Write an enzyme that holds these catalytic residues in place. Structure first.
Site, PDB file in Angstrom:
ATOM      1  N   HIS A  15     -21.079 -55.027  -0.777  1.00  0.00           N
ATOM      2  CA  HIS A  15     -22.312 -55.711  -0.407  1.00  0.00           C
ATOM      3  C   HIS A  15     -22.050 -57.049   0.258  1.00  0.00           C
ATOM      4  O   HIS A  15     -22.752 -57.410   1.193  1.00  0.00           O
ATOM      5  CB  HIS A  15     -23.141 -55.892  -1.657  1.00  0.00           C
ATOM      6  N   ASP A 114     -29.740 -58.634   0.424  1.00  0.00           N
ATOM      7  CA  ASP A 114     -29.455 -57.272   0.068  1.00  0.00           C
ATOM      8  C   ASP A 114     -30.750 -56.646  -0.427  1.00  0.00           C
ATOM      9  O   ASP A 114     -31.554 -57.298  -1.129  1.00  0.00           O
ATOM     10  CB  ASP A 114     -28.403 -57.215  -1.043  1.00  0.00           C
TER      11      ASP A 114
END
Ligand SMILES: C=C1C[C@@]23CC[C@H]4[C@@](C)(CCC[C@@]4(C)C(=O)O[C@@H]4O[C@H](CO)[C@@H](O)[C@H](O)[C@H]4O)[C@@H]2CC[C@]1(O[C@@H]1O[C@H](CO)[C@@H](O)[C@H](O)[C@H]1O)C3
Ligand SMILES: C=C1C[C@@]23CC[C@H]4[C@@](C)(CCC[C@@]4(C)C(=O)O[C@@H]4O[C@H](CO)[C@@H](O)[C@H](O)[C@H]4O)[C@@H]2CC[C@]1(O[C@@H]1O[C@H](CO)[C@@H](O)[C@H](O)[C@H]1O)C3
Ligand SMILES: O=c1ccn([C@@H]2O[C@H](COP(=O)(O)OP(=O)(O)O)[C@@H](O)[C@H]2O)c(=O)[nH]1
Length: 450
Positions: A15, A114
């Site tokens: 991520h 995210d």
């Protein structure tokens, strides 16, 4: 710089990598960059002199909820729902503090998070701040996620049911039932999280996908139908590697060894940043690698083998002349080396997309979540690799490695991987899907305060 963007990654390698790639792409388009990040799994901030880092959410004294969570394995990821449930107040304070301290000639254009930080939408709304979402997993996975209610009523999410495993999924023929069971299992926590992630993605001001159109063209109508905000498909590994955001030291001695190998003669093997196996399976993988008779470079992350610091169960010299084991490499740079003929991957999306973008055909294993879906899509739709979909057996492993790397029968797979790389490259040219996505993203962001 007139316009600042704040990015907020989830603090795990798969991520952090695409967020910081995106940050660099946006920096190269003239934006100033602030990264909000946990102290946990922080990248080397000295690699990014051009970014401002602000550390949040787990400063001392730490929250009792976060403190004692392990820093590796299954339960390290519990930081994600916990921060979603409890982080809003702090995030709002940090955003305001930054907005209050900004210069007269500088504005914050938007927050990019995210997708898994679904809590950030309400926080951003409360400040009249636009939020865009970075999806770090595929459009195909998103399609499956929105199909979960259908999967639920069809009985696929009952794990005690072990019939129809090899059948195509009803109303979703690209997957087999076993893929759905591996991806979602019974996990109520995943259902809750995916539900909220989807809802707050739909409520966002835009969605950036780490992908390209010609990779996932079958999935595009679903995204356009499900998400009212604009979607932008930008294949981040084509813009730059994620080398600077590595959380572990690179073993760069691998390149001297790669330089001694014939072209396309090396199998690169890595099961990513969080996966773990039993000692039995680690040993079966090693034997498959040996049985294949191909040269290999195997990244085994410390903690990969359950029971061992690194690779202690492996006999001294078991890999012969042909094999090398290391702890960590600059993966995309390795995949770009001429010696690499194939990539045995766990089918994590960054790894899969990196391999695609370097034209390297794949052997797929998986450890659940999005990985079986990525493996299935790449193996059966794109046909750029072979899916080892029934565990680890040395004969099966050896046959798959040989099929992709040497057999005439696997030439179509190697060719498919070469052509898919070229489509990724063409997508970046003027008029290409990725070029247009990036140009539109920049214009869209620049218009948000107007
Ligand atoms: C958001 C998140 C919560 C999460 C917590 C841990 C949890 C579980 C994996 C679900 C099953 C039970 C349990 C315990 C497990 O088996 O473990 C759950 C869902 C997905 C997960 O994010 C993943 O977190 C990973 C890092 O841990 C990250 O690398 C992945 O990209 C990301 O998808 C992790
Ligand atoms: C807001 C935007 C983001 C946007 C990004 C590209 C994107 C897509 C069209 C959605 C589907 C995937 C994808 C990837 C797509 O098929 O892309 C198309 O791929 C073709 C090759 O297969 C190319 O020939 C086309 O040119 C290309 O569009 C998307 C939505 C609407 C869109 O409009 C823009 O809004 C901008 C303002 O922010 C404005 O400056 C532009 O004039 C306007 O076009 C465009
Ligand atoms: O030796 C390694 C192994 C992995 N990676 C990087 O770690 C990320 C792994 O992400 P992925 O989505 O493939 O899997 P995850 O680790 O999230 O399961 C990718 O960007 C890889 O390039 C790396 O730099 N060196």
């Amino acid at each position: 710089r007139r316009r600042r963007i704040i990015l907020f990654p989830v603090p795990f390698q798969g991520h952090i990598n695409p967020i910081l790639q995106l940050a660099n792409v946006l920096y190269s388009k003239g934006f100033s960059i602030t990264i909000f990040h946990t102290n946990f799994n922080k990248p080397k901030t000295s690699n990014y002199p051009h970014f401002t880092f602000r550390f949040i959410l787990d400063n001392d004294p730490q929250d009792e909820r976060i403190s004692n969570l392990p820093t590796h394995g299954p339960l390290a990821g519990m930081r994600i729902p916990i921060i979603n449930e409890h982080g809003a107040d702090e995030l709002r304070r940090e955003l305001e503090l930054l907005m209050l301290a900004s210069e007269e000639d500088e504005e914050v254009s938007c927050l990019i998070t995210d997708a898994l930080w679904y809590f950030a939408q309400s926080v951003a709304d409360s400040l009249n701040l636009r939020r865009l979402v970075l999806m770090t997993s595929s459009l195909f996975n998103f399609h499956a996620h929105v199909s979960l209610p259908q999967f639920d009523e069809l009985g696929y999410l009952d794990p005690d049911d072990k019939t129809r495993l090899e059948e195509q999924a009803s109303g979703f023929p690209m997957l087999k039932v076993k893929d759905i069971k591996s991806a979602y299992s019974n996990w109520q926590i995943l259902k809750e999280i995916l539900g909220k992630m989807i809802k707050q993605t739909k409520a966002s001001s835009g969605v950036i996908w780490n992908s390209f159109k010609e990779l996932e063209e079958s999935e595009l109508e679903t995204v356009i139908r499900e998400i009212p905000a604009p979607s932008f498909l930008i294949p981040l590994p084509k813009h730059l590697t994620a080398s600077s955001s590595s959380l572990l030291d690179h073993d760069r001695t691998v390149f001297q060894w790669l330089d001694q190998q014939p072209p396309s003669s090396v199998l690169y093997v890595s099961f990513g940043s969080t996966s773990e196996v039993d000692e039995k399976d680690f040993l079966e993988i090693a034997r498959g690698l040996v049985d294949s008779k191909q040269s290999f470079l195997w990244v085994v992350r410390p903690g990969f083998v359950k029971g061992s610091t690194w690779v202690e169960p492996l006999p001294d010299g078991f890999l012969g002349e042909r094999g090398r084991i290391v702890k960590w490499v600059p993966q995309q740079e390795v995949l770009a080396h001429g010696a690499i003929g194939a990539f045995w991957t766990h089918s994590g999306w960054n790894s899969t997309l990196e391999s695609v973008c370097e034209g390297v055909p794949m052997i797929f294993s998986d450890f659940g979540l999005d990985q079986p879906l990525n493996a299935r899509y790449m193996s059966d739709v794109l046909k750029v690799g072979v899916y080892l979909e029934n565990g680890w057996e040395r004969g099966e492993i050896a046959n798959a490695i040989r099929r992709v790397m040497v057999d005439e029968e696997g030439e179509y797979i190697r060719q498919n991987a070469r052509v898919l790389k070229q489509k990724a490259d063409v997508s970046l040219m003027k008029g290409g899907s990725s070029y247009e996505s990036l140009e539109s993203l920049v214009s869209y962001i620049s218009s948000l305060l107007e």
